[PDB]
Design a protein around this ligand. Structure first.
Ligand SMILES: [Mg+2]
Lengths: 120, 121
């Protein structure tokens, strides 16, 4: 198993130069490296219901990104998704949160996105 | 209502209502304050029956007074041997007594502005 390419998203890059000498393999051209991100949900819900947290990830940069989107609730790691965004492409995700009791609850990621959610 | 949390606003918008919801006082500006002002208005613009409110408040009630050396300061409760007093709880402004803006007034201007611009591409 541990030597087989199972059918999931995959990315891959390399640099090529055609020149009279051999350039330093450690040096590369600088490029931007950040994704644009938006989070969005129902700011509220009824005890028992389900919270739907939507995430848009835009990749304006010239390379394939491979990211692990982690959702935290009240500081504790609740869920994670693996994404592969190709260049000049947006990707949308939905997470489903279950079991929130009455009172306010902190929804945040590992992509600098945060939001207080009320439970009537 | 006065200084309602978000859950309250969202609760009021969750059922048909005959009467519009107004916050006669919200976002208490005492000292270095007025945090999560955009988070209120994201809700007010989205959901029905929410029609805004009034920030507490405009100006800091600080009287002009001189010290022993003679350098000017703004005075508040207990700076006239007056007892019993409630200290600086009369200093709740977005502008200083002389109407000199506190940084928090720049946020109010941003969040109140009437033009909205979105990035398509
Ligand atoms: Mg102030």
């Amino acid at each position: 198993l541990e030597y087989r390419l199972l059918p999931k998203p995959y990315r891959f890059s390399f640099r090529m130069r055609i020149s009279e000498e051999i350039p330093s393999w450690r040096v590369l051209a600088a490029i931007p490296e950040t994704l644009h991100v938006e989070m969005s949900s129902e700011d509220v819900i009824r005890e028992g219901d389900t919270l739907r947290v939507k995430f848009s990830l835009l990749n304006d940069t010239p390379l394939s990104k491979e990211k692990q989107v982690v959702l935290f609730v009240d500081g504790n790691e609740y869920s994670v998704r693996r994404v592969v965004i190709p260049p000049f492409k947006k990707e949308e995700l939905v997470f489903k949160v279950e079991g929130l009791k009455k009172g306010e609850h902190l929804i945040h990621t590992n992509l600098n996105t945060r939001k207080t959610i009320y439970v009537r | 209502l006065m200084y309602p949390k978000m859950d309250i606003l969202l609760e009021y918008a969750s059922k048909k209502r005959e009467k519009p919801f107004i916050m006669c006082e919200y976002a208490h500006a005492m000292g270095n304050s007025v945090g999560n002002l955009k988070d209120y208005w994201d809700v007010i613009e989205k959901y029905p029956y929410l029609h805004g409110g009034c920030i507490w408040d405009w100006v800091d009630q600080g009287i002009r007074k001189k010290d022993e050396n003679g350098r000017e300061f703004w005075a508040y409760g207990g700076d006239f041997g007056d007892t019993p007093n409630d200290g600086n709880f009369c200093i709740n402004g977005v502008v200083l007594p002389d109407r000199t803006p506190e940084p928090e007034l720049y946020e109010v201007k941003k969040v109140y502005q009437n033009v909205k611009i979105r990035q398509v591409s």
